[PDB]
């Protein structure tokens, strides 16, 4: 049973380590791009507010 579980762990770790490195890279990229998207939306909201204030004034 010990040999069996050892095989099982060798299998999972390799897999889970690979998948978790991939997931860490993907999640860092996703969070960074979400931050960029929020920044772009904020800048566009500022542009819209500026256009609105110039038009109203």
């Amino acid at each position: 049973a010990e040999r069996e579980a050892m095989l099982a762990k060798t299998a999972a770790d390799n897999r889970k380590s690979a998948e978790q490195v991939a997931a860490a890279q993907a999640d860092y990229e996703k969070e960074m791009a979400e931050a960029r998207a929020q920044a772009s939306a904020l800048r566009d909201e500022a542009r819209a507010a500026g256009r609105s204030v110039v038009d109203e004034k």
């Binding site: 049973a1 010990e2 040999r3 579980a5 050892m6």
Partner: protein, 234 residues
Amino acid sequence: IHVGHHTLVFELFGMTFNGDTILATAVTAVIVIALAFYLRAKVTSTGVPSGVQLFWEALTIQMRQQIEGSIGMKIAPFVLPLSVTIFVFILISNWLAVLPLQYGGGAAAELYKAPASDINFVLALALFVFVCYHAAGIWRRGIVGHPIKVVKGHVAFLAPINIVEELAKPISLALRLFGNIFAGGILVALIAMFPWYIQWFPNAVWKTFDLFVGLIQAFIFSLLTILYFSQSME
């Protein structure tokens, strides 16, 4: 060649016992027990297995594979210990005869004669296996159902043949082991009639090949035990 004449013979409980055969069986049992205990002390799931661990693992894996390929391990969990103990017992009994435990009287005497060379040892093993797998068949089929299947076998109109083959299962399984080792006990005795300067050659070759012969006999006895179990359980 003076066949027979078991030494250390005694009498107890109103029946005779061959002392030498009992001593050889006890020696084999203590060797097997020492191997088992040394495994138990040094059995490692995570560490690197020892020599005895590798031996036991290989034997257990072989017998478990046989059971899987003949009758599911779920149905026959109790037959793996039987096969392993049978294999080790017979193997050690046969291989302990390779040691130079023989001398000259002026007939040749042998301190350790392989217990299988005695009819009692092989008959006891064969009858124990016989009772064991017949009880297994009774358990898996029923007290009345199992004999009916045993007599019928795979072909009903061959009912007597089955009834012979069944009785042939223990007998052969005993005598096949008997004659193979018994015969050896004679050859070593016969080769003892040679003078020392030419005795070593036939003795050397015979016992070198008897190592393999005893290994094969232990393997065959265990394999046929497993096969008979698979037959009698379903």
